[PDB]
Design a protein around this ligand. Structure first.
Ligand SMILES: Cc1cn([C@H]2CC[C@@H](COP(=O)(O)OP(=O)(O)OP(=O)(O)O)O2)c(=O)[nH]c1=O
Ligand SMILES: OC[C@H]1O[C@@](CO)(O[C@H]2O[C@H](CO)[C@@H](O)[C@H](O)[C@H]2O)[C@@H](O)[C@@H]1O
Ligand SMILES: [Mn+2]
Length: 580
DNA sequence: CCTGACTCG
DNA sequence: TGCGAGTCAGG
């Protein structure tokens, strides 16, 4: 009662059925240009293991991999597709992805390997990757016999688990979410990641040289003001300087000691001008370590491109995340940091960068879901709640509202709708707690629909134990009925936010699928490069800008039909920076 | 390896 | 005492 399989030395016709569980093993966490250590195939005819050098050089196997009519069931097909792209091979026909299936059933399980998915169905005939490859410096590919069995067992699990997972997804009304959204999206993300984004290293490097000089100046200035030399990047050392040497008041403490957070330092500005210099130093230091040095470290020298990896099965709300490098958190709020974007350029001769951003996205989604008359009316009148809130908070006229003021108001708007307390708001706007409370109270008096929705969604979560999004994404909240006030409150706030942020994620994901389809149909050369939660970034020859200015906004705005209209802002230019 | 600092949505 | 993320230097 074990698991017999074949360790083939050549490709046979039987292992090329029109349906099978396929394992194309890429052990390196970052699969870009990473080695494929082994292949496994399980179908109606049997179980097979193939060495990469064998299978990938076989004309029939390569043809099979690229045959869309030959359906494959896998785990993390994007990892396989990309790794194969780097090997010059195209993968088609992926009909089921166990990773995405597990992710949709319950994001909280943190499924990261076949074994973890299998556990959801009490399937034991497979071991966890870590148990096979090892941890850290001990991580290595085992002897062929061991490797082969593992890959085959993972293929066997995928083969036996497909039906059970599709079954539970259907019951949860998430089967289409998988097959028509996440899986198609996965292929689109694979293309985006492989294409990469070109970097102007000469300019980036020059920026780093100049930035290093500015840092040295701010650094010395800080020591001068402190009357002592110390490690500014050490909250511990900085705390001694600020709260022990300079005697500044302690406004907050964490479990390790005095807090030197940006919020605390800003509140200390009236006492000593050293805190402002420190804030500036930390800003510049981050740009240098992360957006200059860190970014240069991941640039592929030969092409000057960076290839991020969009984790599609990680966030608890359905959003994507971006790693090594994270291209979803590149500076833009402050002018100094924003310049880093001048280093992100088109990959071709006379191409340009085109960026589209959903206007007040989650407020529009909230209007729809909460069905708040006043909020829905506002969007039907095409108003800007962020600007309006800015006008009130700063007590200024619309024309006076600066981009930075709107941004601060935007943070306030979402903080309030998502349950910020009067304490939190008073601290953020450094204003009276009573006034903050009044502002919040008044805020919901104007948007009574939103208030009741938030109260109802919390009660619903307590009764059902989970919340859902527009396209049926789900998130369980077991802590929602906890005895502990803190534990419970956090769960209640998740119930308030997840459905909104999650539905916003559903929308942009559908937009990406529709756009990719529209682009291909019109044979446009324009292609997606990045997704930044509620914005899409593309590159395309200058001649296509005219079409994009209409095609991109239209597709994104028509992705889904809500009670309120969806609006998209867009721009383009020679660099990401200019796409403003 | 952990915090706490910075970055973005 | 709003939510969701990732990377870095210092300990
Ligand atoms: C910045 C920010 C954003 N979010 C969530 C919810 C909004 C989405 C999209 O961000 P965006 O700045 O475009 O917001 P949008 O409302 O789309 O603003 P624009 O009209 O696009 O400028 O991310 C948040 O929770 N807290 C924040 O401070
Ligand atoms: O291939 C991405 C996919 O793999 C998982 C593990 O199943 O994450 C791995 O790869 C990521 C990208 O390099 C790393 O950030 C992560 O540390 C590594 O375990 C999934 O989480 C992800 O969806
Ligand atoms: Mn937006």
């Amino acid at each position: 009662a074990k698991m017999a399989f074949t360790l083939a030395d050549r490709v046979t016709e039987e292992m090329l059925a029109d349906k099978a569980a396929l394992v194309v093993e890429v052990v390196e966490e970052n699969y870009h240009d990473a080695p494929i250590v082994g292949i496994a195939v399980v179908n109606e005819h049997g179980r097979f293991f193939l060495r990469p050098e064998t299978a990938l050089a076989d004309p029939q196997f390569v043809a099979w991999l690229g045959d869309e009519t030959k359906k494959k069931s896998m785990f993390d097909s994007k990892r396989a597709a990309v790794a194969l792209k780097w090997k010059g091979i195209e993968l088609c026909g992926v009909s089921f992805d166990l990773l995405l299936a597990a992710y949709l059933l319950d994001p909280a399980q943190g499924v990261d390997d076949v074994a973890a998915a299998a556990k959801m169905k009490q399937y034991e005939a497979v071991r966890p990757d870590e148990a096979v490859y090892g941890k850290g410096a001990k991580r290595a590919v085992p002897d062929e016999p061991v490797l082969a069995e593992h890959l085959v067992r993972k293929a066997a699990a995928i083969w036996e688990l497909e039906r059970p997972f599709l079954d539970e997804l259907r019951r949860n009304e998430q089967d289409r979410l998988l097959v028509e959204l996440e899986q198609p999206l996965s292929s689109i993300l694979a293309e985006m990641e492989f294409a990469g984004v070109k970097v102007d290293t000469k300019r980036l490097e020059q920026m780093g040289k100049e930035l290093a000089e500015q840092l040295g100046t701010v650094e010395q200035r800080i020591y001068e003001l402190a009357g002592q030399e110390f490690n500014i990047n050490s909250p511990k050392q900085l705390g001694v300087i600020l709260f022990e040497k300079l005697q500044l008041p302690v406004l907050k403490k964490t479990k390790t000691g005095y807090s030197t957070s940006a919020d605390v330092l800003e509140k200390l500005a009236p006492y000593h001008e050293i805190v402002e210099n420190i804030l500036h130093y930390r800003q510049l230091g981050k740009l240098q370590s992360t957006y200059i040095e860190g970014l240069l470290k991941v640039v592929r020298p030969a092409t000057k491109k960076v290839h991020t990896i969009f984790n599609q099965a990680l966030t608890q709300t359905g959003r994507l995340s971006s790693t090594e490098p994270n291209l979803q958190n590149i500076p833009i709020r402050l002018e100094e940091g924003r310049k880093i974007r001048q280093a992100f350029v088109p990959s071709e001769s006379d191409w340009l960068i085109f960026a589209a951003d959903y206007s007040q996205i989650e407020l529009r989604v909230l209007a729809h879901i909460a069905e708040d008359d006043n909020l829905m009316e506002a969007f039907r009148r095409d108003l800007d709640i962020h600007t309006k809130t800015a006008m009130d908070i700063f007590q200024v006229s619309e024309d006076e509202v600066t981009p930075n003021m709107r941004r601060q108001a935007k943070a306030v708007n979402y903080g309030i709708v998502y349950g910020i307390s009067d304490y939190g708001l008073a601290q953020n706007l450094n204003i009276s707690r009573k006034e903050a409370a009044e502002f919040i109270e008044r805020y919901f008096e104007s948007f009574p629909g939103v208030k009741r929705y938030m109260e109802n969604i919390v009660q619903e979560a307590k009764q059902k134990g989970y919340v859902t999004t527009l396209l049926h994404r789900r998130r369980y909240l077991p802590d929602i009925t906890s005895r502990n006030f803190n534990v419970r409150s956090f769960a209640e706030r998740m119930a308030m936010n997840t459905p909104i942020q999650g539905s916003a994620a559903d929308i942009i994901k559908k937009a990406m699928i529709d756009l990719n389809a529209r682009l291909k149909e019109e044979r446009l050369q324009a292609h997606l490069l990045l997704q930044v939660h509620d914005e899409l970034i593309l590159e395309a020859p200058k001649e296509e800008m005219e079409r994009l200015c209409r095609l991109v906004p239209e597709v994104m705005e028509q992705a889904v039909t809500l009670r309120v209209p969806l609006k998209v802002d867009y721009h383009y230019g020679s660099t990401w920076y200019d796409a403003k």
